[PDB]
Amino acid sequence: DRATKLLTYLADVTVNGHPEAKDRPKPLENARPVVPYAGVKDGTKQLLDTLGPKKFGEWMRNEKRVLLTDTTMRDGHQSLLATRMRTYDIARIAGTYSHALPNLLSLECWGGATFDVSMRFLTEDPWERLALIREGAPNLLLQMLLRGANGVGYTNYPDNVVKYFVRQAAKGGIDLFRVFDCLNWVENMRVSMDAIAEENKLCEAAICYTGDILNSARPKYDLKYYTNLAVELEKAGAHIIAVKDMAGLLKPAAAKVLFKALREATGLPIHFHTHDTSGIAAATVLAAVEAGVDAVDAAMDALSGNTSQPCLGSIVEALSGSERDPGLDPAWIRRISFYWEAVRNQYAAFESDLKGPASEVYLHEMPGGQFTNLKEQARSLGLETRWHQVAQAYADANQMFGDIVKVTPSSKVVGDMALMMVSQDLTVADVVSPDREVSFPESVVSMLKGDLGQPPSGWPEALQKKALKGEKPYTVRPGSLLKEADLDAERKVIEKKLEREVSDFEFASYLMYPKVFTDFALASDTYGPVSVLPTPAYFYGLADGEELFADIEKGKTLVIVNQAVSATDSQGMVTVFFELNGQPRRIKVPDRA
Amino acid sequence: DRATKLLTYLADVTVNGHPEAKDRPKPLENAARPVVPYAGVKDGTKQLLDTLGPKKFGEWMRNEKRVLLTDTTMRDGHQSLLATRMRTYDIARIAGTYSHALPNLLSLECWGGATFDVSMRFLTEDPWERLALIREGAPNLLLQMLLRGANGVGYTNYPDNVVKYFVRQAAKGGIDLFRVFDCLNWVENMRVSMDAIAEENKLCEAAICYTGDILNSARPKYDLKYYTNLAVELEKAGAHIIAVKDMAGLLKPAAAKVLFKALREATGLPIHFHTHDTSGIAAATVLAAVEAGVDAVDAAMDALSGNTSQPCLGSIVEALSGSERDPGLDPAWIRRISFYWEAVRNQYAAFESDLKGPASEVYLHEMPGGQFTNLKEQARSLGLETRWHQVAQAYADANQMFGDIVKVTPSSKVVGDMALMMVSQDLTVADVVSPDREVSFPESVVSMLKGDLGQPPSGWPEALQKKALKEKPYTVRPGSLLKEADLDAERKVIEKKLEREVSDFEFASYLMYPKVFTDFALASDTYGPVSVLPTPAYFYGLADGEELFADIEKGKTLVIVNQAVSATDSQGMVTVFFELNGQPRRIKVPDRA
Amino acid sequence: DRATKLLTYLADVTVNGHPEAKDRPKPLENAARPVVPYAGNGVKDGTKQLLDTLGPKKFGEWMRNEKRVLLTDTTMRDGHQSLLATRMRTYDIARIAGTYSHALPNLLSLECWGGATFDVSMRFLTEDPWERLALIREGAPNLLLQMLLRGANGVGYTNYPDNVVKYFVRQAAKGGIDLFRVFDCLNWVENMRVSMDAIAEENKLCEAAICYTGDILNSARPKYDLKYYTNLAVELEKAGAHIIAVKDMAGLLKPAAAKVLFKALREATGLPIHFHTHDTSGIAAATVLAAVEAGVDAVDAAMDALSGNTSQPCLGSIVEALSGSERDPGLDPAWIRRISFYWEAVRNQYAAFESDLKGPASEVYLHEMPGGQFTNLKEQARSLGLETRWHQVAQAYADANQMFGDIVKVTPSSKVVGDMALMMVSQDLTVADVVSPDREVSFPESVVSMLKGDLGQPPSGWPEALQKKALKGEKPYTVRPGSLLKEADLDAERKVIEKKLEREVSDFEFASYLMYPKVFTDFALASDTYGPVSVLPTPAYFYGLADGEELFADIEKGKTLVIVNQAVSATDSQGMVTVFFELNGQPRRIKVPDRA
Numbered sequence A: 001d002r003a004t005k006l007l008t009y010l011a012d013v014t015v016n017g018h019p020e021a022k023d024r025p026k027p028l029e030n031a032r033p034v035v036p037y038a039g040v041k042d043g044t045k046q047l048l049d050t051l052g053p054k055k056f057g058e059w060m061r062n063e064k065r066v067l068l069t070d071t072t073m074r075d076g077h078q079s080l081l082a083t084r085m086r087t088y089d090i091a092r093i094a095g096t097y098s099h100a101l102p103n104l105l106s107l108e109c110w111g112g113a114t115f116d117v118s119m120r121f122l123t124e125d126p127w128e129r130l131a132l133i134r135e136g137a138p139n140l141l142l143q144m145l146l147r148g149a150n151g152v153g154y155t156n157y158p159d160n161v162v163k164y165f166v167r168q169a170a171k172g173g174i175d176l177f178r179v180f181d182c183l184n185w186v187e188n189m190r191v192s193m194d195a196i197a198e199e200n201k202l203c204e205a206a207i208c209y210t211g212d213i214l215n216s217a218r219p220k221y222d223l224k225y226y227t228n229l230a231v232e233l234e235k236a237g238a239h240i241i242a243v244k245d246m247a248g249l250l251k252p253a254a255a256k257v258l259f260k261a262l263r264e265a266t267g268l269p270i271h272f273h274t275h276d277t278s279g280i281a282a283a284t285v286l287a288a289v290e291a292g293v294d295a296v297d298a299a300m301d302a303l304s305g306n307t308s309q310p311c312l313g314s315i316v317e318a319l320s321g322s323e324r325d326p327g328l329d330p331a332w333i334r335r336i337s338f339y340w341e342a343v344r345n346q347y348a349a350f351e352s353d354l355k356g357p358a359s360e361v362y363l364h365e366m367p368g369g370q371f372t373n374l375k376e377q378a379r380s381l382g383l384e385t386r387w388h389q390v391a392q393a394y395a396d397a398n399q400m401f402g403d404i405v406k407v408t409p410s411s412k413v414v415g416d417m418a419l420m421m422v423s424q425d426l427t428v429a430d431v432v433s434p435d436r437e438v439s440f441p442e443s444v445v446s447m448l449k450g451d452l453g454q455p456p457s458g459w460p461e462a463l464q465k466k467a468l469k470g471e472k473p474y475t476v477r478p479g480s481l482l483k484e485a486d487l488d489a490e491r492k493v494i495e496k497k498l499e500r501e502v503s504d505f506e507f508a509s510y511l512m513y514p515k516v517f518t519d520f521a522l523a524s525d526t527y528g529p530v531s532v533l534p535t536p537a538y539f540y541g542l543a544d545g546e547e548l549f550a551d552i553e554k555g556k557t558l559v560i561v562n563q564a565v566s567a568t569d570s571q572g573m574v575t576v577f578f579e580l581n582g583q584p585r586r587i588k589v590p591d592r593a
Numbered sequence B: 001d002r003a004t005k006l007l008t009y010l011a012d013v014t015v016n017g018h019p020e021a022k023d024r025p026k027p028l029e030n031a032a033r034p035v036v037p038y039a040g041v042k043d044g045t046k047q048l049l050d051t052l053g054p055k056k057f058g059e060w061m062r063n064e065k066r067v068l069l070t071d072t073t074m075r076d077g078h079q080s081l082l083a084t085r086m087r088t089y090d091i092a093r094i095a096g097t098y099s100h101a102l103p104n105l106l107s108l109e110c111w112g113g114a115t116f117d118v119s120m121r122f123l124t125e126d127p128w129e130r131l132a133l134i135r136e137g138a139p140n141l142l143l144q145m146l147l148r149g150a151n152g153v154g155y156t157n158y159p160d161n162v163v164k165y166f167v168r169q170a171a172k173g174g175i176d177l178f179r180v181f182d183c184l185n186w187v188e189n190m191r192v193s194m195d196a197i198a199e200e201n202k203l204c205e206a207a208i209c210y211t212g213d214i215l216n217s218a219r220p221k222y223d224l225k226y227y228t229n230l231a232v233e234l235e236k237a238g239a240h241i242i243a244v245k246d247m248a249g250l251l252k253p254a255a256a257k258v259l260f261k262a263l264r265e266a267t268g269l270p271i272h273f274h275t276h277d278t279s280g281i282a283a284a285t286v287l288a289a290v291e292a293g294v295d296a297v298d299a300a301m302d303a304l305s306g307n308t309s310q311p312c313l314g315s316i317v318e319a320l321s322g323s324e325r326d327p328g329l330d331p332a333w334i335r336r337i338s339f340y341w342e343a344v345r346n347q348y349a350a351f352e353s354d355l356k357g358p359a360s361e362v363y364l365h366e367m368p369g370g371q372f373t374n375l376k377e378q379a380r381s382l383g384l385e386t387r388w389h390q391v392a393q394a395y396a397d398a399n400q401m402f403g404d405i406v407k408v409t410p411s412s413k414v415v416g417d418m419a420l421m422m423v424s425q426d427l428t429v430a431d432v433v434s435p436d437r438e439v440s441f442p443e444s445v446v447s448m449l450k451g452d453l454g455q456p457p458s459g460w461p462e463a464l465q466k467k468a469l470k471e472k473p474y475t476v477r478p479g480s481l482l483k484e485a486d487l488d489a490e491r492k493v494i495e496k497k498l499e500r501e502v503s504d505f506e507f508a509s510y511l512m513y514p515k516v517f518t519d520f521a522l523a524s525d526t527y528g529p530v531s532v533l534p535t536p537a538y539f540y541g542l543a544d545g546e547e548l549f550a551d552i553e554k555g556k557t558l559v560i561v562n563q564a565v566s567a568t569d570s571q572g573m574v575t576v577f578f579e580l581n582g583q584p585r586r587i588k589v590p591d592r593a
Numbered sequence C: 001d002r003a004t005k006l007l008t009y010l011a012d013v014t015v016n017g018h019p020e021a022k023d024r025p026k027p028l029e030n031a032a033r034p035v036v037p038y039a040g041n042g043v044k045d046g047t048k049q050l051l052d053t054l055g056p057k058k059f060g061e062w063m064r065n066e067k068r069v070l071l072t073d074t075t076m077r078d079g080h081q082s083l084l085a086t087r088m089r090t091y092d093i094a095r096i097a098g099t100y101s102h103a104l105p106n107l108l109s110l111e112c113w114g115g116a117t118f119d120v121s122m123r124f125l126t127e128d129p130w131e132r133l134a135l136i137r138e139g140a141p142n143l144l145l146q147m148l149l150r151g152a153n154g155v156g157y158t159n160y161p162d163n164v165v166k167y168f169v170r171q172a173a174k175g176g177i178d179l180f181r182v183f184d185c186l187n188w189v190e191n192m193r194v195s196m197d198a199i200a201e202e203n204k205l206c207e208a209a210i211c212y213t214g215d216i217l218n219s220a221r222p223k224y225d226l227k228y229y230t231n232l233a234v235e236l237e238k239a240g241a242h243i244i245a246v247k248d249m250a251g252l253l254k255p256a257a258a259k260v261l262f263k264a265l266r267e268a269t270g271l272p273i274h275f276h277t278h279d280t281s282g283i284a285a286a287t288v289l290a291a292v293e294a295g296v297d298a299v300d301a302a303m304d305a306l307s308g309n310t311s312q313p314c315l316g317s318i319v320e321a322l323s324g325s326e327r328d329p330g331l332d333p334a335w336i337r338r339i340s341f342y343w344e345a346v347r348n349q350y351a352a353f354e355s356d357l358k359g360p361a362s363e364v365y366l367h368e369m370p371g372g373q374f375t376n377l378k379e380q381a382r383s384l385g386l387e388t389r390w391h392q393v394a395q396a397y398a399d400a401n402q403m404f405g406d407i408v409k410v411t412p413s414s415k416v417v418g419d420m421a422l423m424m425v426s427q428d429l430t431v432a433d434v435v436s437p438d439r440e441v442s443f444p445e446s447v448v449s450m451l452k453g454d455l456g457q458p459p460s461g462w463p464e465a466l467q468k469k470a471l472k473g474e475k476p477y478t479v480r481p482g483s484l485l486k487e488a489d490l491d492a493e494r495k496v497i498e499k500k501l502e503r504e505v506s507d508f509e510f511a512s513y514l515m516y517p518k519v520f521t522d523f524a525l526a527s528d529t530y531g532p533v534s535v536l537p538t539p540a541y542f543y544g545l546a547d548g549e550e551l552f553a554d555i556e557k558g559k560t561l562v563i564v565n566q567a568v569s570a571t572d573s574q575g576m577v578t579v580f581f582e583l584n585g586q587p588r589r590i591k592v593p594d595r596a
């Protein structure tokens, strides 16, 4: 029966294709990824277990070598492939990291858009993904990106929901939480931060970088701004401070000044995250290293550059033989990169048309992980030919909102405003004007009400009046207004709707994404453990006479040969003929054409 | 096991088409399956012959006032319009209906002619099986064959003991009435077949082939006396019936008034008239013959009548209805059987010629009806489609060059070969017989001029014979020269080549057509009793998801559904997925493309 | 401008195809064009000079006394009407007339006009039936030209005022018709007189036809017996006929009946007898030869290439059967064959319009469908989705006949039994249903019309009960339809068509408007747009010109245009396509719409 359900998925996708891939570019008809051939050395996970998060932070600070986080399994494909990377390809390589690169600080492999996209577009459970990475890499810290009060969502959730999710995240295998607020509002971070400390995990509290500290004509986001936030985050209980440069705006000279001041303002270790949209982010990471930074993020070469992180292999190689040499074997970095390259070839459907570095990024400030999603939304609205006016709008809308930190979900709001402006030919002067009528997007109404928080100088008065159209704003923390969710009764609703008990993890999914989770859980009961399928089989099914080996449970491999596919019958059904371990099986599926 | 072989055939033809039908016109898709009408049976001419014997039966025919009818639909009808491609399945299934509905019929012409070899070579079916099914369906009617005298059912001369052997088997197989003819109207060559049919106590109906025009005084060679003498000669040779075989449909009404009055005066034997409707007036000649006392006439069912076939049975009967000689056939039943044949005919669209209607051109060329369409294609084969009227002029020229000879299988084919060559190479009667013009004749023209088909009245033309042979000719009977074949030896040969014993019938097939029989036997061993398949299935296999009912045998229907067809694999094989009586079956056949 | 107009036609059909041919089977690709047989001396006087000399009355006497059987060739009319939906073009028909004239000068006549040709020429072939007649008259000045004329219906399907019927006949004679075969669909002699008199006023031959139906040798069907026919022959003589025809439209006359019928007709009247039949049965030649044996004066046949099945039986083979006999027609068989080969090559161009008829059918003695309707009714059936139940329709046609009183079925009465049969199958009605009290039925317009009396009267009248139910309160009439019709105002209606066309018209065109106002109007506007497309050879008319194809078009007697299709543009932003022609060496560009 589990095997029968799988055959049903393979039939369906063989006959009808997959909605996300069928109408997009295909992989070359030509070679599956090969896991390189190799107990594992204890690493940062064991140390953290030994020391506890606070002392583990001190250890990082005192460590001379720069510490490396690999982002390939989350930000890398979030930024380059619409986050469509699958568990099968991610989990299959964890053991290789574990054996080959046991010195790594952490694998960023969770949170961001992965939680949402796994269930919705990939038909898979993010919690199972985490558990398979945990088992494959028992010696490395597993790191997630946590959106503070938004969790893994796009809306501010109630305090008890936020706390419940963090508890399950830590139970599921998360050792290191990078937590941020999209307005750098420390008050909105305290609930998350406290909950991370209560699970006795690493709270790496992030400060989002924007502007240019070395440009005295933008004083709002100056050095003092960052050094103060660092100090405040320490008082709030951070184990580590992160600079999250989501748009890749930090320049080398600025890094040199920033990381020095930061390490003088707080004793906590500093972790630096950036994107390579400019084509020079590697120079910034290196400058940060020269200036004492304790840890940096990079992506494997094959999923690096442009809107992703800068090249991990080339950064390591730049540091090779130096005092701060991170002690990672370049031959193994290459082998792993060659794996990800062959992996990436399978996701041709989701490539963007980004051709290289663009200094334009310093003008628009679009986050790396948003840039391509937003280019799609603009195509969607017939704007493809006017992309450069969109980027100009985004920068204009930013100034109109008071010049703000733009990261998920504040970035999406500027996005929605920018798109509207271009579509309807509206200038800043018109959007605010009293004599021009404007129906603002639900996201802009929401933010201007105070649903995402408060910037330094509040929100601009006049823009806020016209937007709310009678509504009274609020300036307090959103979670302080929200009602503690009835958890026992919220559980009953989902358990009644699935006609079965659920696990604590599944309930957490439901709290974050009730509709996505529900739809996903009903799909799972139909199609089975489709995450065990190789990626070409998942997206395109099986060719006539093609043989597939799939491991259903740990013990047992299923041998599936697609022998033949019928025409559509009078009742609208197609019959796919299979061999399962040398036994014949027919499976009927609907012709969705 | 016969089932597995049937599935092998159905798969083989579904995947590759039938070679005879693949590249030709297709029946209309909507297509109504032919429907056998709904109805012991009245004793008829079979029981009469069984009571009276052949001589007494001939007397009975003679004394009968009503004109007796032979239906030719089963044989000459489709030989002449559909290149003899009609299948046992469609033929046998209506036999019982003839038996119940038209019990007064003299006979069913259903065997001999081109059917014998065409069934095996082109339809993968045994002609003896066909005969026995008609016998079992029509136990009350005479079954009639066409026998080519010394040629048996071949195109060549066979030893006397072989001719004797084949007639014996044909009698065992169910043939009651033997129409026997010689291609030059030479009685000496007819003497053995006639003795063999008498020795087996069946009806010897000795035919005289009609050619020329008795009422034109500028053509004396084929005057009335020629035919009256040949009638008396064939009576002295022991005929029970005399036939006038007007192979090319050259007999005109006025000539019929004279010929048949004179014939019945010359002999006490009954007379049987066979013609073809190429001129579009042969029904007039038939009606004139009736009005002049002829005892029996041939017609074909409406739906397979006209043009190069026999004239319309239904309309003839209808013209006689109520007259002194009315044949006592129910017109409503002729109509119903004709509606059956119409639907059957539609299945054989692949084999329809382009013949538009009547042609008085027939009086010039004298091509037999049953050859006309064969030769038009043979000329198409040699790229002559565009000069068909020159080929027709060449056939008439050749005829005169050979001395104004009787044209019919196989002498007709000889003249055909000569005409085709003459046109190909732009050659006249003057060129073909010129002293200084080096030709290379067909292997059939030499053969004829040698003496292999026998002797015409005046012999062969001296000059045209020398240039053709180069080799002394013989004037004697061909069978007097052919050594008596060792039957016990030739039977051990075929039984070794097939590694199994054969029936007496099968050995007679071998004697007539060693190559075609050998190939058919082998194909039968591979594909099974394919003759039980309905005609669409036999020529085109099964549509995707199509359900066939086949009666592998009288006590057993099989239910066969084509559920799917695989792609061609790396061995070049194709797998067809059947459901046979509810059970999955997998048949591999080569991709012949 | 005439040339420019032709180019316009050629561009249009090249780009868009012809509506009649586009989606139908295509002729073979290579195709030898029809070759007109070479003749070079004058033409022997024939029946045309005889009628001019004697007048019709003395001509009929000459026919009667003439020992040899006389022949009418119907290939130019009934032949293709029956086999090719009457789609045969003037170009192919006129080109052989001269050959008939030089090579078969003993023919009684050429049946070359009337029937469906008048209508179809204009509507489906964009040509003028008068131009056709005139071109045939020019090419065969020694043979009688013969038409089928439908009596009260002219060359139409409706009934017309007397003065219009007369006016048409007058133009037909001016246009070149010598021999009018005139018939009434119910054999109602009263309905023929106006026609018969018009023909006599024009001093042409009036061949009054008796349509044959049933079986005179079947006493279980007395209504249509021997004397029914001999009495009509007598009344037609009294009414001024020069010749009596037996018009066996369905090919139902059998050989033994012909033997009795023609011996009797010759005894009953002093007029010559002329026999027309069809070969649907596959034995009509036998009936023709029986009629000759029994003394008939003339018979109709079709050239071999267009003979058989629903057409006439085979001219060449019939002539061959008579060769050397007492009544030998004196027609060279070799020339019959050469002319048949020409028609064969002609016919290959019309593959689009071939029916799927396989051969003879004794079924014809059941349904009694006319030969020149059989195929047309078979399309109607297909149209209504009834291809698969054709034999049901045929059974219903025979059922509908007996319900109507067992009538004569021929244009336009046959058209009405068709419509009734077609309705009966669709809606699964028996005869008992159609005449039922408690079953409401919406009859065809044509059937309401017939039972009212717009087609005239059969001998025993219409069935009372069935007429009540069909009319639904409408009072019927039994008088001659034309006696109730207001005399058309010919001066005023001439002004109407001349106003609509913004030009004066000819007497002939006017006669066409009177018969078919709508069709003629449409054809006259089409001609103003497209010019004299009748002069194009047939492949070019139906399929235009292939890429790079050179065509020689005889735009008139003197003058030949050389036309090459050099290129065809894509469809432009206004939905137009430009065809680049060379015309006599000069570049020309014609824009036509993309009709896709």
Ligand SMILES: N[C@@H](CCCCNC(=O)CCCC[C@@H]1SC[C@@H]2NC(=O)N[C@@H]21)C(=O)O
Binding pocket: A012, A013, A016, A017, A018, A019, A020, A119, A120, A121, A122, A123, A523, A527, A592
């Ligand atoms: N368009 C949706 C996203 C849905 C895409 C993937 N669908 C699922 O995960 C549901 C599971 C069942 C769908 C399978 S996939 C291929 C086979 N082919 C089909 O068309 N359906 C089945 C969104 O925007 O939310």
Ligand SMILES: N[C@@H](CCCCNC(=O)CCCC[C@@H]1SC[C@@H]2NC(=O)N[C@@H]21)C(=O)O
Binding pocket: B012, B013, B016, B017, B018, B019, B020, B120, B121, B122, B123, B124, B523, B527, B592
């Ligand atoms: N080309 C041959 C005529 C042979 C045609 C029919 N063949 C036989 O009777 C032999 C056995 C059947 C072969 C089957 S038929 C359909 C399936 N499709 C194929 O292409 N071969 C197999 C001649 O000229 O003699």
Ligand SMILES: N[C@@H](CCCCNC(=O)CCCC[C@@H]1SC[C@@H]2NC(=O)N[C@@H]21)C(=O)O
Binding pocket: C012, C013, C016, C017, C018, C019, C020, C122, C123, C124, C125, C126, C526, C530, C595
């Ligand atoms: N469908 C009409 C019959 C009309 C058929 C012939 N058409 C005409 O006679 C109109 C004159 C010009 C039309 C030409 S033909 C080819 C070119 N292609 C076209 O589609 N139109 C022009 C009916 O049933 O009444």
Ligand SMILES: [Cl-]
Binding pocket: A512, A513, A514, A515, A516, A517
């Ligand atoms: Cl959701």
Ligand SMILES: [Cl-]
Binding pocket: B512, B513, B514, B515, B516, B517
């Ligand atoms: Cl052989």
Ligand SMILES: [Cl-]
Binding pocket: C515, C516, C517, C518, C519, C520
């Ligand atoms: Cl009209």
Ligand SMILES: [Mg+2]
Binding pocket: A060, A061, A062, A063, A064, A065, A269, A293, A294
């Ligand atoms: Mg350090």
Ligand SMILES: [Mg+2]
Binding pocket: B061, B062, B063, B064, B065, B066, B293, B294, B295
């Ligand atoms: Mg007798």
Ligand SMILES: [Mg+2]
Binding pocket: C062, C063, C064, C065, C066, C067, C068, C272, C296, C297
């Ligand atoms: Mg006479």
Ligand SMILES: [Zn+2]
Binding pocket: A075, A246, A273, A274, A275, A368, A369
């Ligand atoms: Zn990032």
Ligand SMILES: [Zn+2]
Binding pocket: B076, B247, B274, B275, B276, B369, B370
């Ligand atoms: Zn024959």
Ligand SMILES: [Zn+2]
Binding pocket: C078, C249, C276, C277, C278, C371, C372
């Ligand atoms: Zn007619």
